[PDB]
Design a protein around this ligand. Sequence first.
Ligand SMILES: C[C@H](CCC(=O)O)[C@H]1CC[C@H]2[C@@H]3CC[C@@H]4C[C@H](O)CC[C@]4(C)[C@H]3CC[C@]12C
Ligand SMILES: C[C@H](CCC(=O)O)[C@H]1CC[C@H]2[C@@H]3CC[C@@H]4C[C@H](O)CC[C@]4(C)[C@H]3CC[C@]12C
Ligand SMILES: Nc1ncnc2c1ncn2[C@@H]1O[C@H](COP(=O)(O)O)[C@@H](OP(=O)(O)O)[C@H]1O
Ligand SMILES: Nc1ncnc2c1ncn2[C@@H]1O[C@H](COP(=O)(O)O)[C@@H](OP(=O)(O)O)[C@H]1O
Lengths: 282, 282
Amino acid sequence: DFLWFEGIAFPTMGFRSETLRKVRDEFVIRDEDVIILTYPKSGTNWLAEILCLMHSKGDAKWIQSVPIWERSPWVESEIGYTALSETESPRLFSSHLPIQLFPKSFFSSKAKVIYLMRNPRDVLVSGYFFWKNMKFIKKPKSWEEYFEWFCQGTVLYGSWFDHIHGWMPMREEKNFLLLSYEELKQDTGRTIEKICQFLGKTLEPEELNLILKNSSFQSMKENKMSNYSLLSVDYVVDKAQLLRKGVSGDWKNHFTVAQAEDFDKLFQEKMADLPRELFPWE
Amino acid sequence: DFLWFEGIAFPTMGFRSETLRKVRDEFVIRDEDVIILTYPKSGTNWLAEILCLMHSKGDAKWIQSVPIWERSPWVESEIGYTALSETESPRLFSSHLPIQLFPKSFFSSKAKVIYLMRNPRDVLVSGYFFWKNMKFIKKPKSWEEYFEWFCQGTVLYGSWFDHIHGWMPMREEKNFLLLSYEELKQDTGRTIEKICQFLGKTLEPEELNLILKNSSFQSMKENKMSNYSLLSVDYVVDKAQLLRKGVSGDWKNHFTVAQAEDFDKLFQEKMADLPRELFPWE
Ligand SMILES: C[C@H](CCC(=O)O)[C@H]1CC[C@H]2[C@@H]3CC[C@@H]4C[C@H](O)CC[C@]4(C)[C@H]3CC[C@]12C
Ligand SMILES: C[C@H](CCC(=O)O)[C@H]1CC[C@H]2[C@@H]3CC[C@@H]4C[C@H](O)CC[C@]4(C)[C@H]3CC[C@]12C
Ligand SMILES: Nc1ncnc2c1ncn2[C@@H]1O[C@H](COP(=O)(O)O)[C@@H](OP(=O)(O)O)[C@H]1O
Ligand SMILES: Nc1ncnc2c1ncn2[C@@H]1O[C@H](COP(=O)(O)O)[C@@H](OP(=O)(O)O)[C@H]1O
């Protein structure tokens, strides 16, 4: 099962309805906050690690000594809700909340949000493999069942189409940056430069080079704090697996031509009201 | 007994020649640092508390839960030197170092330093009473003996006249703010606003009012974290007394007329090569 709150499914561990209500209604957003906004499995941790490394000008001291989920906690989670109000600025944190569930306090604030979007065919695949070792998530019978869950929106954090619809209006706001996992992957340095300019920071060539080096798929895979290897056995069976493949386009190795034709039609029906140029793929 | 390093006396506890060398030669200043530079008793802890409060926008949560010397460590102290390497940006910290002893690394950085200057007659008095409860400082036989030490510069951190001379040439640098205790005391709100503009920050009226409220002499005297009441008894007899009187002009209550005339003569002979408009007394 899931924890159901306002029509959206949430994990059965680490979340409470009472907290999620305070998150929306009471949680105080500071103008100095930097917030990562993802639909789950769109590169959230990648971007957190880039962000932590921009902040230290490439120096890996803190990403190797602090668990990634303390460095950029989930505001909607109990532990993150609680930790953040005790944390001095500048706070970095994450959320997979749809706009209507996001702390109301943000909309009168100057806080900076980075929304990362990803091809949902890739998010679908990424999630499909990830949820398997998680002890507390409802597992699909099959690739085909998960595919149908994903398309219907009856998955952790609701529909991708909905998530995206509801955040996209913000793209015209000065304190909203819209990125894609695709562009981040294609030109990581250019993207990091884009993030600096938005955040009003500069980096010297040497510092950028070291953030490229230290946020690589392999650095992260090898970093105990970042690879999810520290999760309790209360949460997970065997290990990880956050860092699976780390590319765009893996959906083609898993969708059948018939699945692909159906998603195309579904995607085309649901995203008709938004500009096609918004979506890098494909 | 003092620890003597480069012709400058340092406390018998908490300091090492070897560390002090690395402070000058090896300690790395980040462009995100905010540093308070004072000759001891110019108002270091009051500046520290204000800055902490500017950072939290008036919210006293962290000043009441973290010791002031941990919120703003002495870079030259052993504990400070070490703790700061491990601290994430933005770092706030304090120094009483004359320029020639200060991290060389600062001089190629954009780190912002706030120099706080105070009437040395008032500094003399503040130190005179302060040192009495401290177990590890060489104490004077009399008001007169201490007066003589201070004038000669044979006190912790050396001459006030030298300290001041060393740092003044910086007053023209973009990343240097020169303040006095006198102006901070006379118009606190306006001084805080001057620091904001320096540090590139804005505050809402309500936030300023809370910083004014919470950085008051009485708030600080009442705050267990800020008033030295936590100092280990392996450091002090009785308690405190950091929060003594909290005004300028108290030196008149202690200097005999003969001392005032001698000090005037000396101050006039030493500060002649500097513009008098630079010292807002008196
Ligand atoms: C709040 C919990 C403790 C954190 C702490 O101790 O500080 C953490 C530990 C493991 C986390 C889950 C990991 C997998 C999933 C990731 C996906 O992007 C979002 C959902 C997902 C199910 C997480 C939710 C938050 C969990 C349960
Ligand atoms: C390094 C020590 C521990 C700090 C920690 O545990 O983080 C602290 C505790 C008490 C401090 C002294 C207080 C009195 C003096 C004040 C003056 O403005 C500067 C010198 C002075 C002698 C200090 C030096 C640093 C000391 C010894
Ligand atoms: N350094 C990195 N470079 C590229 N992709 C990364 C990465 N670190 C994590 N990812 C990818 O981000 C996805 C997980 O996203 P999230 O952070 O939202 O949970 C996984 O995708 P795949 O399963 O497609 O490999 C993961 O491999
Ligand atoms: N909020 C405040 N307002 C004014 N003065 C303060 C203050 N907090 C501390 N001080 C004063 O600053 C001096 C100590 O400075 P430092 O922190 O540099 O050692 C003491 O001066 P007096 O001895 O004149 O009372 C102390 O009273």
